[PDB]
Design a protein around this ligand. Structure first.
Ligand SMILES: [Zn+2]
Ligand SMILES: [Zn+2]
Lengths: 146, 310, 310, 146, 310, 310
């Protein structure tokens, strides 16, 4: 099945349907290097999971941490020569950039050459994300209805 | 003489349940077998001092569908003179001299009741007056509820959206609390809840009501989902966009809905009902806009005709 | 059932020559002996989202001249709501619920075709849609050409002015190239010539055409001089005023014109036809504006009446 | 190439970087079945191809033709019992639906709950796409832009 | 380099306790002994994309009293900006190719902060960015409190008026929440109450606050009475008037006020402070507008001067 | 007296090769070692009868950096001018009774030149007179080319974009046609091609030019790539988008460009130069706007100063 290549990253244990979000959002397709994706993989250990293998590619630390918001319980696995040489799990990053959208219609991020940037704060029952620009704090549930 | 013959239709509070029922009966009759020359030779004035293209075209189609002539205007601008000097009183005192009935939308609460005092014997009908009344809308709404539910008594009606400022939700509650056994669910953003007096009338008659936070709490109990448009501009854009995971209706949420539940909306519906909702059977707001004809035709037939033979 | 019965009149490309001919026949019949109560009891909506007083009054006179009621509006402003939220789709979904037919001018190419998908069974008729189609104009134009020339086949038609942007000249060419033996002369300012696709349809069917530089090259061959208004503002004022010794028509230039040549214009004609042209017999553009009635009456009689008895 | 699935579609010899563009655009990923995807593969011709295996779904004659503007040389092999029970090549449609966007900025399609649609005509060299609504005709290079 | 040298003053959040003290102490010295040539040969863009004549005239009078030249505009109506493609990022990239500091007012939240990514090394001071920030108004208010009470710590501050949308009351609560032992009384109608995240922030840093119904309740222990404008249009006309007696100050109310108590109000004052309050020692809203000059000069001296040695 | 002393800068046609060199050499010295008091005690009318905030702010920042005072207006909207009889000749005859130099932007071709018959001895600099001239923009462009290529002679200049209405590309072709051995590539869609009288003028003085379809064709030998704005509205929406790939620069296109190549564009830039081109060494449109200051100061120093001895 899909589980190891010579070198690269195996992103394992993504819940169903997030695998394509991650591909899109993190532009992981835009590399002409061997990616194998398997969606709706069985895995009784999940019920249904998704796995992406990017061959000869290593996700620098923070890249891993951005996945915290979407497939939070996924294991990034380093294979830097024929097997699992480093395991990693997503931690919430302190800032999430480029990928989110400001809920505030009257935020200026919307009409301009400006990457979104949000401050992360896991507080109480969720995570609050404060916009760089309009300084307004929203629940990630609002921000991710998107 | 019919009960409503040559009566001024100005407020819903003013109409008794008996009169609501006569209006709804006639309308169910005209729909079915319409007499198209009943108001032949009448000249009705469509005086929209505030413009509303849908209403003005529903009312005017009605006048026509019964064989009536129409003279009238539209502002949200200055028509002529009436900007200065022309007091609504002087303007009606001259228009009573011309026509048989006056349909009128005006941007100030109480403009139809003032008009009455100058219309002489000409009946005036309220097509909306500021934030006060819109009887014609509540009538077509009752007709659609009656026509889908088979009754107006013992229903579970969820009212959602701008409950504080929606002209209509205020009136629909007054009309439906003139019938027995109804239960109301009020789902509204905190800052836009049902004003205290609606709720106090509701507790004197002792009608069953409860506030809620999202449609999905009562999805499966609701017979009628009446939705109003949460107006974006009376709110901060970061506050409008932040309410929960919204109170906007998507077909998905209808998944646990009764087979007979209908979703109603005065319209415009910009975003508070999504396109897939349109395809589901529970979609009933365009059908509703069409029942405006028979309701308003009913109204014009009784006010202007002594006895209705149909 | 007539061929066009309850058909949406949206594009000229969509009508076959057989249908063009049925429209033109009926119209020649109604002119002569008009039945004025044929559409009695119909309520037609005149929905001008873009305003055009001439068109709106030609179409509305037609509805009336056949015994029809009319409800409707005019923008080039905001009517009410429909500025935000009201999607044309929601607006038609509510207007299908009221009326029997929808005549509509809208400033966006394809607005009448979208409307179709929400008009339910109500037929919609295109009174102009952006820079795309205006079928009703081409129909009244064919009727005038037929009525003056006795035919629509084997004619020498000179098309002059803004050939690049004139909605009408594009359509008249599509309609006339559905008949045999026609020859076209295209006289236009360099920067405003006939777009390549008109000319490419013309060469597949192999219809005879040629470009020219001034009316006086074909004065004596032309059966029909169709003139469009060169719009001053889409041009530099020193460039508009510098083209040759102009391509504007003066009676003098008619001196070598055939006895049967007619000069046509949709109108407005501000300067591109001079006043003395008005007095000559070749003047036919007001007569043309009047044939708009019978053409549009034809249209409404067939779309709304199963079989035409006349 | 790689190994097989339990009866379904194999779309192979898709131009590289068109692969994902089809997964997203035709929305092939909203299935409960194992979709296995290989990106930027050798083991097929013209260097690196893309490859998609949708299990159990079989794409209609129609959908097969819809790949033609992106994938035209792809092969829509049809699998039953780990063997190609049938083989389809993308032929050009006559109506491409809601994957394209009318370049006409005053076309009503844009602001409304209508799906886009275009009449397709001519073959390979210039493919003219005609908008259903504004009836304006464009070259496919212009339509296939933004 | 002084701390504020060449920094962009975008939000109060970005200013520390020490930065607030350094701006207020400087305003104190300039009020004292002015420097009319300190910014000579500097050119400042006064870019008011949203018009605000009151704030503009204070900022430009401050720019002039330090010797600088001013160029700029006040759109809202129109000059030629923010239209037909031309983005804000590109405007700032052109403007900071001529000026030494950009002062700007914009209708959208976040605009000043974006300007900052484009000015490069020219400072951007925010004169108002939508419902977000306004640091310069909070700085003149803090300077008025410091000037009149002698301190910014251990104060009794009542915020009276629209506290939900009050951009001013929010920022001054944050600014003042940096100093110690401040205690707050919030007196607002419920539709307009002080939002929860300001309240959360208060609790968290152990600062005390309390809601009160009437100004009467807390007059005796108040140090600073900061009033805000209720914009009538944030309520129905009916709703507005009905608060059983209101949130309007009259000089009768102040009879029990502390000798040092000052009434502050950001202006325009329309109805919440009665005329009779002006001739009271406590009225301090115009003297506050006056110190706008000082707080505004301080900032421009410190941002444009590596060392101010006064 | 220096050559330009007290002359009216109305057209590039009126400036000689030597005058262009004398203005550009002066701008070079002021960029170097500025003169902030050189125009002290002079008052300049910045009269923008047509609004143009971008040009106004550059001209007024230039007036300020030489020490002069500025009075003026920006109509287009309205101030109180050019209305109810009051002619331009009379306005200039009043204004030149107070000011030392008149800078003006007007919507009509020839206005600056007429002002000149009325100012008497006050100089009139033209900031834009309709589709006619704009000398000050051509002077900052020439200064940007001289600054970056080291010369104004023996250059490879591509003009890309609307070349028919491009007031800028016309003037710079004339200015540059005064220096030697310049060679031109014109890349424009045919609807917008470089007018024949510029082309005639080119041929006549033995200067070489060539039309090319794509920017690709000539990237390698280009020195200055001057882009222009296509105003979408000079074409149909349909026409606009359809140029098989377009006239828009992206940084991919520049991969084969000469080490010294600079992309110039008069701004607003909307769509013809992609964001990614900004972070390329070649992008020079904002640094060009920056030199607007210098070219503009040079002129005002030379026109108002009998001898500039720098
Ligand atoms: Zn934001
Ligand atoms: Zn289109």
């Amino acid at each position: 099945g899909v589980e190891a290549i010579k070198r690269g990253t195996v992103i394992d244990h993504i819940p169903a349907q997030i695998g394509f979000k991650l591909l899109s959002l993190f532009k992981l397709t835009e590399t002409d290097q061997r990616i194998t994706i398997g969606l709706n993989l069985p895995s009784g250990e999940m019920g249904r999971k998704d796995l992406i293998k990017i061959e000869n590619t290593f996700l620098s630390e923070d890249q891993v941490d951005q996945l915290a918001l979407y497939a939070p319980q996924a294991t990034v696995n380093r294979i830097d020569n024929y097997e699992v040489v480093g395991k990693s799990r997503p931690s919430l990053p302190e800032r999430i950039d480029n990928v989110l959208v400001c809920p505030n219609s009257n935020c200026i991020s919307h009409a301009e050459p400006v990457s979104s940037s949000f401050a992360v704060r896991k507080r109480a029952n969720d995570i609050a994300l404060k916009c760089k620009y309009c300084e307004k704090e929203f629940s990630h549930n609002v921000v991710l209805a998107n | 003489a019919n009960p409503l013959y040559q009566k001024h239709i100005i407020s819903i509070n003013d109409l008794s349940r008996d009169d609501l029922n006569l209006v709804l009966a006639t309308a169910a009759k005209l729909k079915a077998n319409p007499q198209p020359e009943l108001l032949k030779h009448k000249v009705i004035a469509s005086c929209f001092f505030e413009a509303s293209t849908r209403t003005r075209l529903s009312f005017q189609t009605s006048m026509h569908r019964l064989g009536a002539s129409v003279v009238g205007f539209s502002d949200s601008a200055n028509t002529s003179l009436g900007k200065k000097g022309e007091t609504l009183a002087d303007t009606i005192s001259v228009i009573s001299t011309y026509v048989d009935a006056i349909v009128m939308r005006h941007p100030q609460e109480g403009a139809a009741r003032l008009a009455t005092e100058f219309s002489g014997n000409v009946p005036v009908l309220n097509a909306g007056d500021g934030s006060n009344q819109h009887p014609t809308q509540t009538l077509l709404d009752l007709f659609t509820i009656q026509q889908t539910e088979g009754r107006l008594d013992n229903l579970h009606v969820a009212m959602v959206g701008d409950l504080k400022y929606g002209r209509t939700v205020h009136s629909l509650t007054q009309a439906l609390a003139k019938f027995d056994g109804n239960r109301f669910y009020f789902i509204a953003p905190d800052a836009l809840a049902m004003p205290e007096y609606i709720l106090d009338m509701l507790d004197e008659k002792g009608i069953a009501w409860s506030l809620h936070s999202s449609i999905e709490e009562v999805m499966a109990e609701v017979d009628i989902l009446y939705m109003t448009r949460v107006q974006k501009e009376r709110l901060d854009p970061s506050e409008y966009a932040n309410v929960k995971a919204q109170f906007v209706l998507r077909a998905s949420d209808l998944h646990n809905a009764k087979a007979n539940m209908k979703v109603l909306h005065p319209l415009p519906r910009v975003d508070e009902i999504a396109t897939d909702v349109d395809k589901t059977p529970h979609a009933w707001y365009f059908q509703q806009a069409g029942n405006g004809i028979f309701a308003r035709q009913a109204l014009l037939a009784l006010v202007l005709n002594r006895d209705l033979v149909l």
